[PDB]
């Protein structure tokens, strides 16, 4: 009955910034790792980078991302952030949030409403 909503996409050159956001919506002690995936049009869901929603939680990000993604939280805003830097034509793909849940005791990602789409390419070039 909660989903996540991420947003704050848009279109960005290479080597641009963009910081994507989503509120902790239904954050409680047993759903608190919140996961993010990006799925670029025409392929498939790939897991970007995870925050463990508690004090001294851990930060995990994909080998793609590593080093140029960071993401964060505000407990006072409740709110998640995923501060992407150097980014890459690659990087283009929707974004969303997602709750971790235990079901059939395996770790799912649940809980995903509105992704929010990210482009990132050169503007200034043309060819007709």
């Known amino acids: 009955e909660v989903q996540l909503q991420a947003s704050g996409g848009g279109f960005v050159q290479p080597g641009g910034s963009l910081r994507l956001s989503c509120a902790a919506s239904?954050?409680?002690?047993?759903?608190?790792?919140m996961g993010w995936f990006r799925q670029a049009p025409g392929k498939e869901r790939e897991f970007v980078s995870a925050i463990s929603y508690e004090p001294g939680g851990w930060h995990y990000y994909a080998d793609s991302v590593k080093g140029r993604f960071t993401i964060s939280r505000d407990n006072s805003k409740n709110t998640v952030y995923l501060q992407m830097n150097s980014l890459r034509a690659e990087d283009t793909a929707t974004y969303y949030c997602?709750?971790?849940?235990?079901?059939?005791?395996?770790?799912?990602?649940?809980?995903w409403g509105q992704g929010t789409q990210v482009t990132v390419s050169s503007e200034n070039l043309y060819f007709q």
């Open positions: 239904g954050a409680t002690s047993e759903r608190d790792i």
């Open positions: 997602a709750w971790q849940e235990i079901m059939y005791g395996e770790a799912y990602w649940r809980y």
